[PDB]
């Protein structure tokens, strides 16, 4: 059934599965043209397909030569993330195909479940979380390579960078989580948090700082207080 | 004019011939019915007096032989049977009239309603959805499950309606996922129409059987199957126009027929408003429409 509060230690077993985010797949600007009417312009997307046990991140670039004349884009969008992701778990070897995938948004079950028909014992599964994954786009690296690409390009990231040395599943995607809860509520603020001290870098292979476990602490502590201080403002409270 | 005598009546029972019904009281003298429009399928059913649970009855087409009812103690409920005997089965019907113990099926000259609730149904297809195949006739009742139903216990008991399932490898090309999923032509036209049913008229025929079953026995997978039949041809955008005006007239006269006071089990509401209103064919079903509003605007 629906993902929860209640079986959220389900992500960390030995089962594998993705979590499948489409927010970011069909961005366009909107402006005004030259008669004074509202018109968008599309630029590159990206599927975000997450193993949440391992940080396996199948980053699947969008290009905007995808929409060239096409209508309905934003219900399209939907089908083309869950003809990528299908064709994703096609690539994979037996072995690594998921036993379920979850969709951050249920308006992609449909199109994911008709996309899936081959694969009948892959469950595909809603959330009644709210999940941050929008703010992926937020991390540099990964909306560089988006902006940049020029063709349909899958790129693969370790969201984690090299956490699991240290910490387990469990503990990664709640800090993953925060960071991009904070990144989602201000950005500004966030990326200040994150690169404030310039001694602490980012190594080539790296999606995030080189914390110490130390440091990693004060900044979850920086981005818990962000948050809480947002919802005061967003709300009066 | 044909006729089935019934045995006697043991029981008190709401006796049903199509749409007309009758009480009869714990052994009232009651042995049939009369004037029974020849050219037509029929259905005589039952509802005990003091089990308001499990309506069930016989379909059957009086060209197909002579028919007869009788009530079984052991079983405890009115049979359907033939009487092979053809002279001793007009003596009987003869003796019957003469005593003035039968009604006679009430037609008003002026009413088309089973004609048109009936117009593309068939005894020898409804012999292949309720298989029994040493009956002439066909048991239906209440608690029947479909053989989608089953897949999702008894064959021999079953309602092998023609499975529909929008999220199948039958109903989507690979490749077509996203049209096909949107507008179900393909699967209407090709797989259903062309491929299994043939025709339309054999389309037509066992949605209006699985209307019938729905409100005659309450039977929920017939009503499960009814509007999925509907869904699909309101749900693809290129459908022949025979066949929508003669879905517009199928549906009206079921809408009429159905009993008021049931249009909230029987009537699937996200159906209905995706026909008249959001599909492909909302603006094909004009009597549809109008009298769904005038009597049912709350489901709306």
């Given at each position: 059934?629906?993902?929860?509060?209640?079986?959220?230690?389900?992500?960390?077993?030995?089962?594998?599965?993705?979590?499948?985010?489409?927010?970011?797949?069909?961005?366009?600007?909107?402006?005004?043209?030259?008669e004074?009417?509202?018109?968008?312009?599309?630029?590159?997307?990206?599927?975000?397909?997450?193993?949440?046990?391992?940080?396996?991140?199948?980053?699947?670039?969008?290009?905007?030569?995808?929409?060239?004349?096409?209508?309905?884009?934003?219900?399209?969008?939907?089908?083309?993330?869950?003809?990528?992701?299908?064709?994703l778990?096609?690539?994979?070897?037996?072995?690594?195909?998921?036993?379920?995938?979850?969709?951050?948004?249920?308006?992609?079950?449909?199109?994911?479940?008709?996309?899936?028909?081959?694969?009948?014992?892959?469950?595909?599964?809603?959330?009644?979380?709210?999940?941050?994954?929008?703010?992926?786009?937020?991390?540099?690296?990964?909306?560089?390579?988006?902006?940049?690409?020029?063709?349909?390009?899958?790129?693969?990231?370790?969201?984690?960078?090299?956490?699991?040395?240290?910490?387990?599943?469990?503990?990664?995607?709640?800090?993953?989580?925060?960071?991009?809860?904070?990144?989602?509520?201000?950005?500004?603020?966030?990326?200040?948090?994150?690169?404030?001290?310039?001694?602490?870098?980012?190594?080539?292979?790296?999606?995030w700082?080189?914390?110490?476990?130390?440091?990693?602490?004060?900044?979850?502590?920086?981005?818990?207080?962000?948050?809480?201080?947002?919802?005061?403002?967003?709300?009066?409270? | 004019?044909?006729?089935v005598?019934?045995?006697?009546?043991?029981?008190?029972?709401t006796?049903?011939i199509?749409?007309?019904?009758?009480?009869?009281?714990?052994?009232?003298?009651?042995?049939?019915?009369?004037?029974?429009?020849?050219?037509?399928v029929?259905?005589?059913?039952?509802?005990?007096?003091?089990?308001?649970?499990?309506?069930?009855?016989?379909?059957?087409?009086?060209?197909?032989?002579?028919?007869?009812?009788?009530?079984?103690?052991?079983?405890?409920?009115?049979?359907?049977?033939?009487?092979?005997?053809?002279?001793?089965?007009?003596?009987?019907?003869?003796?019957?009239?003469?005593?003035?113990?039968?009604?006679?099926?009430?037609?008003?000259?002026?009413?088309?309603?089973?004609?048109?609730?009936?117009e593309?149904?068939?005894?020898?297809?409804?012999?292949?959805?309720?298989?029994?195949?040493?009956?002439?006739?066909?048991?239906?009742?209440?608690?029947?499950?479909?053989?989608?139903?089953?897949?999702?216990?008894?064959?021999?008991?079953?309602?092998?309606?023609?499975?529909?399932?929008?999220?199948?490898?039958?109903?989507?090309?690979?490749?077509?996922?996203?049209?096909?999923?949107?507008?179900?032509?393909?699967?209407?036209?090709?797989?259903?129409?062309?491929?299994?049913?043939?025709?339309?008229?054999?389309?037509?025929?066992?949605?209006?059987?699985?209307?019938?079953?729905?409100?005659?026995?309450?039977?929920?997978?017939?009503?499960?199957?009814?509007?999925?039949?509907?869904?699909?041809?309101?749900?693809?955008?290129?459908?022949p126009?025979?066949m929508?005006?003669?879905?517009?007239?199928?549906?009206?006269?079921?809408?009429?027929?159905?009993?008021?006071?049931?249009?909230?089990?029987?009537?699937?509401?996200?159906?209905?408003?995706?026909?008249?209103?959001?599909?492909?064919?909302?603006?094909?079903?004009?009597?549809?429409?109008?009298?769904?509003?005038?009597?049912?605007?709350?489901?709306?």
């Amino acid at each position: 059934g629906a993902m929860n509060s209640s079986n959220y230690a389900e992500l960390f077993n030995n089962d594998i599965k993705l979590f499948v985010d489409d927010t970011n797949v069909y961005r366009v600007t909107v402006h005004k043209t030259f008669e004074g009417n509202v018109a968008t312009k599309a630029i590159n997307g990206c599927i975000f397909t997450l193993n949440p046990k391992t940080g396996h991140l199948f980053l699947k670039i969008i290009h905007t030569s995808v929409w060239a004349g096409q209508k309905r884009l934003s219900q399209l969008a939907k089908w083309k993330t869950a003809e990528e992701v299908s064709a994703l778990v096609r690539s994979l070897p037996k072995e690594e195909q998921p036993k379920q995938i979850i969709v951050t948004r249920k308006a992609m079950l449909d199109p994911l479940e008709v996309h899936m028909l081959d694969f009948p014992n892959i469950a595909i599964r809603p959330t009644e979380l709210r999940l941050p994954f929008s703010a992926a786009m937020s991390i540099d690296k990964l909306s560089d390579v988006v902006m940049k690409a020029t063709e349909p390009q899958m790129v693969l990231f370790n969201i984690y960078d090299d956490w699991l040395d240290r910490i387990s599943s469990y503990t990664a995607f709640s800090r993953l989580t925060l960071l991009l809860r904070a990144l989602k509520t201000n950005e500004e603020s966030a990326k200040m948090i994150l690169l404030s001290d310039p001694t602490i870098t980012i190594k080539s292979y790296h999606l995030w700082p080189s914390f110490t476990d130390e440091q990693w602490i004060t900044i979850e502590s920086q981005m818990r207080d962000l948050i809480l201080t947002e919802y005061g403002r967003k709300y009066n409270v | 004019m044909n006729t089935v005598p019934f045995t006697s009546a043991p029981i008190e029972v709401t006796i049903g011939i199509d749409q007309y019904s009758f009480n009869v009281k714990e052994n009232q003298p009651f042995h049939g019915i009369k004037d029974i429009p020849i050219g037509h399928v029929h259905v005589i059913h039952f509802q005990h007096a003091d089990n308001s649970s499990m309506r069930y009855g016989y379909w059957f087409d009086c060209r197909m032989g002579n028919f007869y009812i009788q009530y079984d103690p052991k079983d405890g409920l009115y049979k359907m049977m033939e009487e092979r005997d053809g002279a001793k089965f007009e003596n009987i019907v003869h003796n019957f009239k003469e005593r003035q113990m039968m009604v006679s099926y009430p037609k008003i000259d002026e009413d088309d309603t089973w004609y048109n609730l009936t117009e593309f149904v068939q005894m020898d297809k409804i012999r292949k959805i309720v298989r029994k195949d040493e009956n002439q006739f066909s048991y239906v009742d209440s608690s029947m499950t479909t053989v989608q139903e089953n897949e999702l216990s008894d064959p021999a008991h079953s309602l092998n309606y023609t499975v529909i399932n929008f999220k199948s490898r039958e109903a989507i090309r690979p490749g077509h996922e996203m049209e096909d999923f949107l507008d179900k032509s393909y699967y209407l036209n090709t797989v259903m129409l062309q491929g299994i049913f043939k025709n339309s008229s054999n389309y037509f025929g066992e949605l209006q059987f699985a209307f019938l079953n729905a409100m005659f026995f309450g039977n929920y997978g017939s009503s499960l199957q009814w509007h999925a039949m509907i869904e699909l041809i309101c749900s693809s955008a290129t459908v022949p126009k025979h066949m929508l005006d003669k879905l517009d007239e199928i549906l009206y006269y079921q809408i009429k027929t159905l009993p008021e006071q049931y249009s909230d089990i029987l009537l699937n509401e996200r159906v209905w408003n995706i026909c008249l209103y959001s599909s492909f064919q909302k603006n094909s079903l004009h009597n549809t429409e109008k009298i769904m509003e005038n009597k049912y605007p709350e489901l709306l």
